[PDB]
Ligand binder design. Structure first.
Ligand code: MG
Ligand code: MG
Ligand code: MG
Ligand code: MG
Ligand code: MG
Ligand code: MG
Lengths: 671, 671
DNA sequence: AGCCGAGC
DNA sequence: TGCAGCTCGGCT
DNA sequence: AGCCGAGC
DNA sequence: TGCAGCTCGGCT
């Protein structure tokens, strides 16, 4: 017995014979981990150790469909390598001779995603062959080319075996991977998030399955929510926020390759995941077809996908470029960066907890994500309509209700109820034998509608005679031919119903992280707008309070610089051939202040470098007049700021954003 | 059917088969642009199929290689062609599913090579199809505009007589190698006789001699190294980027490849560029004697000859400390940097302190010519350079590979015998401690020792057992034999039997000289001599450049020190005086315009900014004393440089390189 | 019959 | 250089 | 029977 | 995220 049809398998020499139960199959996380295991086993390892690589997450066979299980290539390989059989028990020690391996050792990364792969394989064995768990079938190889040989030489220190201890292990596995335990995972994760934050005070060989689920796998389930559930403040996820942080710091004025940008994000923001997910995010942030972003913060310089296939027809990230949109810094003012709490990843400032935009971006581009226990789904909302409601709330008026709105969508979105909408396309009769379809429902892609609706109508009973296509890259135009009898019956039943041009939009899972990082469920879009409004209005007061101190410190600096230049050109003070110590002691004696900008930032010996680092040009005629004008202009800038309210500063940013939004969207219609 | 990536025409195979055209594109990216350009009307009589690069040259290929080519067999089934079948008249044109094949590639040199390979494929198997005008080309979203004006972009190949058969044979027959040399020699000659001046149907002869010849010349320019620096244009772009960025931290290879394409205008795929960076960083036995890039990661070992290198997305690299010592930064001011669309990209060549073309063994395969050089010892190269500086004759040099424990004996002119190490332990054991150069460990184990242990269908077994005790950089085989078999192996020669000796022939030392001319070199001493005269001439250029630059810097400090001394004594004042009055007074007092800028302008109003941009600190006591010391130190720096000779400057660079070479190679043995 | 490497 | 799978929750 | 997307 | 082909010339 020896496998022949599996390429990536490095089967053990003694596997399949009578020493099969003494052999261990090593399932690795990827092909890179496979090479590290083969080089670590050396020559002695290939006798009773086999290595097979897994290409990521495996199928959750618990309550999975019968067709998906039999057609899973990754699982069918594991069954053939080990020699397992469905509906067969391995309790009586006998019948263990039909197995080619006696142990399965999981070696993955020591991160959260590695723990998820362990649990999925545990769930795979537990669901099909629970009798193997009561023995010693599953084990793991933990890690902290050359270092691999030291790990396998000290395998007993890195080898941990899973142990079945009773029904509490079956409940823990069911809690994590059963579709019927969704509500239990909410309570399971609510107690974890509570106990984790309630620890403000302060801060082996075998491992039971219950301890693995409730102390190791739960770290993935929480991290899965933290990476997939967006924030209410900026509408971002931690991965999306790292991309925009990097773009803000680099400030690229030229097209930048997506793959090149993804590499820059990983370094400057400490992105600890694969480049495929990061390049996926950058493409998602740049798409602008009907159904994606209402305001794309990155430009789609290249083939980023069309509405024909819903972005699936996007080119490779190695051939497409992107850059910040002109609306990015207008939505995220640079001055507001001084109010954010930037996080640290190993003494490196990486990203803030969240950005604070001028309008709720969580409603503009429709935040959406799937985590563990909870899920989020929000539709797109009109940017101008949101700005209007913000202006109304600044004047003390009640905000108008908002319906979902998608840019360049020619259909209709009618409200059926709270968080329930009817999205309809456009279809009208041309003559007694022709109908025209000029718009599809939101996120109903053209090729999918053609193959799943029009093709069954054309072939197999049949309803239409023929149809032609006259689409562009951004519009839809179907011309369908029918008989007079068939068309008359379609009008009686409803053209939008027959041609499947109406879909329902239900949004009863508006779960987001608040400003304090707590997970909360929101019932209406108005509740999100109100909570964002109070926080953003409070931070416009922080911006003014910060700008008054900074501009005031800059005004004091220019006062000392102008005083020194005026006192020097009049002979009141001299610095020629004077020692550094005597010059500093003379400046402090004449009432000159140390660097006020530095002193103000420290508040959040004497330093006169801001005076003496000025060029000799400063003593010339034209530079004296220029310095006085800048000093007076800075003084008027502080006074003009104190007279303004936080609402005034917000309306200024809103007006500047709407002005550029009109110009950008007008150029898009022309191009 | 049975071809996934094929978008077959609707009318292909039916009664309109001879009216259909098959579009063969250069890659899948061109395929997606061809289907979108045909629109809906195009799919009736136009099929699109993508080619994955260069296709097989079926003229002198083996019969087994032709039948097992998946790319060519697909083209045959789509068109419906048959081998040996003639297509002279209408007797056999009804069995074809397509009537025309249109080649759509990039408008670059490599696109022309794919056209010729497809022309060579049809001409060799079915020459009767060429007289009917079977092959066409499509020269160059925007695709819909191209296919709408197809008549402007559609050029048809025309057969005009026996001169077309000779032109195709000249380009793709292996018996026409010497003819391609003269074919390209006349091109390079006539090309240089045109620089004194300046600057629908298409015949196959005109395609070969006016379009494909541009690739064959560019193929040599990209694959044949230069004598000066031992680099190819692709390798030189990598070193330019690394020199310009000056990375002090580990940089990802894929991230570096993207930076090279932007900063040096690399107009090819990143896969080839990432290949070069890995090749430039390898340091195992058989690769580079002095690797200019560091192998921070899995860059391949001698077990598989670098083929076991990790993905370029997971390995890092950086400049070696010997790079800037071999290529001094001061010499960059003497190079002729090229321009790619008003962007300075790279020099024609770098000028290293030693002939790098001999250190790492430059080698490359072009069209007509090929290059192959072995590695030579760096210290022996430095010693011959020191001898030639003293007017002595350089000693002969044998190939030398770093950390190679074998022997390289000269059998004749440009012919050497490379042997490993094998010795007898006892009457039943032999030990192999070294393999010949570029004989990799895993290849030697599978192709030599395994047939000796088990035997083949032809050769019998020779050894009883063998063990392995290798490291990542050393080889140790312990082989067991019988007394009879060992006696016969010693009689025939242990190095002969165990395949531990290989022949090294170097009769193709073709390189580009300093003037860009292709030249064949008969001995290594001729390469060393031509490099020596050029490098010695540029050390005179460096001194001539340093005398002017240091002299200009000395003049600058003289004016700056004079102004500060004249200001602290009251001899000149600048307070509250106009810019025009201050500049006019400096010219009146004999102050010179910026000498450093004026000197650099000579290498192609009055500027006193270098005086007045100094800080106010310059007037203090300590800064006056510091400025005077810098002025006097620069003056002594000019005199100390004038006293040195171009030979003295060279000996300083050689001594500094050998000192660091000893430290690096000592740390490598420890690490 | 296949390596070497810069290209597709 | 391009192509294939899976998780997790809500909704259809 | 499968989309949505940040992960493997 | 990793895996497969080909050119071109000299040499084994
Ligand atoms: Mg990982
Ligand atoms: Mg979206
Ligand atoms: Mg190209
Ligand atoms: Mg080499
Ligand atoms: Mg599901
Ligand atoms: Mg060949």
């Amino acid at each position: 017995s020896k496998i022949k049809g599996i390429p990536k398998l490095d089967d053990a020499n003694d596997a399949g014979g009578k020493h099969s139960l003494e052999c261990t199959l090593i399932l690795t996380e990827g092909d890179s981990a496979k090479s590290l295991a083969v080089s670590g086993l050396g020559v002695i390892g290939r006798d009773r150790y086999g290595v097979f690589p897994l290409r990521g997450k495996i199928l959750n066979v618990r309550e999975a469909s019968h067709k998906q299980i039999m057609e899973n290539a990754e699982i069918n390989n594991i069954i053939k390598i080990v020699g397992l059989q469905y509906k067969k028990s391995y309790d009586d020690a006998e019948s263990l001779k039909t197995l080619r391996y006696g142990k399965i050792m999981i070696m993955t990364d020591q991160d959260q995603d590695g723990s998820h792969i362990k649990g999925l394989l545990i769930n795979f064995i537990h669901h099909n062959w629970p009798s193997l768990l009561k023995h010693g079938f599953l084990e793991e190889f933990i890690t902290p080319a050359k270092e691999a040989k030291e790990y396998f030489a000290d395998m007993e220190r890195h080898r941990i075996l899973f142990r079945y201890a009773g029904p509490e292990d079956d409940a823990a596995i069911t809690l994590a991977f059963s579709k019927k335990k969704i509500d239990d995972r909410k309570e399971w994760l609510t107690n974890f998030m509570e106990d984790r934050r309630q620890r403000r005070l302060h801060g082996t060989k075998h491992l039971t399955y219950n301890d693995f689920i409730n102390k190791e796998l739960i770290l993935f389930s929480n991290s899965d929510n933290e990476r997939s559930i967006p924030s209410l403040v900026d509408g971002f996820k931690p991965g999306q926020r790292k991309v925009l942080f990097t773009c803000f710091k680099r400030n690229d004025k030229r097209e930048v390759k997506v793959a090149q940008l993804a590499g820059s994000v990983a370094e400057m923001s400490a992105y600890h995941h694969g480049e495929q997910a990061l390049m996926m995010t950058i493409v998602n942030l740049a798409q602008n077809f009907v159904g994606s972003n209402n305001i794309n913060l990155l430009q789609p310089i290249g083939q980023f996908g069309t509405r024909l296939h819903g972005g699936k027809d996007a080119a490779s990230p190695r051939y497409i470029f992107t850059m910040l949109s002109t609306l990015a810094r207008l939505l995220f003012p640079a001055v507001d960066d001084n109010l954010l709490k930037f996080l640290y990843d190993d003494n490196q400032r990486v990203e803030p907890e969240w950005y604070i935009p001028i309008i709720p971006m969580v409603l503009i581009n429709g935040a959406e994500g799937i985590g563990t226990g909870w899920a989020c789904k929000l539709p797109n909302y009109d940017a101008r309509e949101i700005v209007n409601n913000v202006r109304r709330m600044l004047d003390g008026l009640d905000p108008h209700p908002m319906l979902p709105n998608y840019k360049n969508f020619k259909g209709t979105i009618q409200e059926l109820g709270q968080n329930q909408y009817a999205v309809s396309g456009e279809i009208f009769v041309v003559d007694r034998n022709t109908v025209e379809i000029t718009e599809l429902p939101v996120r109903t892609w053209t090729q999918v509608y053609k193959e799943q609706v029009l093709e069954p109508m054309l072939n197999g009973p049949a309803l239409i005679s023929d149809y032609k296509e006259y689409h562009t890259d951004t519009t839809v135009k179907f011309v369908v031919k029918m008989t007079e009898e068939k068309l008359a019956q379609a009008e009686a039943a409803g053209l939008h119903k027959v041609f499947k041009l109406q879909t329902t939009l239900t949004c009863n899972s508006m779960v987001l992280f608040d400003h304090m990082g707590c997970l909360k469920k929101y019932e209406t879009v108005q509740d999100i707008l109100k909570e964002f409004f109070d926080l953003r209005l409070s931070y416009y007061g922080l911006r003014k309070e910060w700008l008054v101190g900074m501009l005031g410190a800059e005004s004091t600096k220019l006062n000392n610089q102008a005083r020194f230049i005026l006192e020097k050109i009049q002979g009141k003070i001299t610095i020629e051939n004077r020692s550094k110590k005597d010059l500093i002691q003379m400046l402090v004696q004449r009432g000159y202040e140390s660097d006020p900008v530095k002193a103000w930032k420290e508040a959040q010996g004497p330093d006169f470098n801001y005076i003496l680092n000025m060029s000799l040009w400063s003593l010339t005629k034209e530079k004296v007049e220029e310095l006085i004008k800048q000093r007076d202009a800075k003084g008027r800038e502080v006074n003009d700021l104190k007279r303004k309210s936080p609402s005034d500063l917000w309306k200024e940013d809103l007006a500047a954003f709407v002005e550029e939004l009109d110009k950008v969207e007008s150029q898009e219609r022309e191009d």
